[model samples]
Target: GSSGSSGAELTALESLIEMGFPRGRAEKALALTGNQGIEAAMDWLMEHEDDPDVDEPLSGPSSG
Candidate 1:
């Protein structure tokens, strides 16, 4: 179980996902900005859109 954030964070996550971002990516973006708000998260996601690290899953040991 994850220590999921507050209601505002959940709402922001839903909004980002509704816009078609991957769940994991949206969550990362939200976390990166401390859930400052939807706009900030979206900007963060956009800024990192081409980052190879953001596209990688965090489920296992490094494959590099």
Candidate 2:
């Protein structure tokens, strides 16, 4: 059973996983950041959005 905070974390993890990041990586990063909930985890994930190894692809480029 999750309290409000744990519930939030679970929700965050669910959203991130649905967005295509690996579950283990998301969990590991969230853990390493010393955050116990969704908001902080989300901030950390967004901060790392520029990391090519994990970033979602940009879609605006043209074939020209």
Candidate 3:
């Protein structure tokens, strides 16, 4: 795929980055939603923010 994006996408990326999302992840989320809108991207992020591998667990892993 080409390594470029439209103005709207750039705006979305900037907004998401400003909101504290990682630049790479924000770009992927925005693209995945077809740039539907910020709210949609936000929802997507929130929904995926709890991955066991991606996020740290509050306590140590179980010994089982």
Scored by TM-score, the top model is: 1
- Per-residue lDDT tens digits of candidate 1, residues 1-64? 4354453534888878767689888898999989777899989888987877876555888667
Please say which candidate is ahead in TM-score: 2 or 3: 3
lDDT of 2 at 24: 63
The 10-residue segment of model 3 with minimum total lDDT is: 1-10
Over 4 Å off in model 2, which ranges? 1-15, 52-64
Stronger candidate by lDDT (2 vs 3): 3
1 or 3, greater by TM-score: 1
Candidate closest to the true structure, highest lDDT: 1
Model 3 Cα lDDT, one tens digit per residue, 1-64: 4343453444877878867678666777788777877888877788778744534468997896
Over 4 Å off, model 1:
1-10, 57-64
lDDT of each: 0.80, 0.63, 0.71
Task: Give the winner by TM-score: 1 or 2.
Answer: 1
Ranking the candidates on TM-score from highest down gives 1, 3, 2
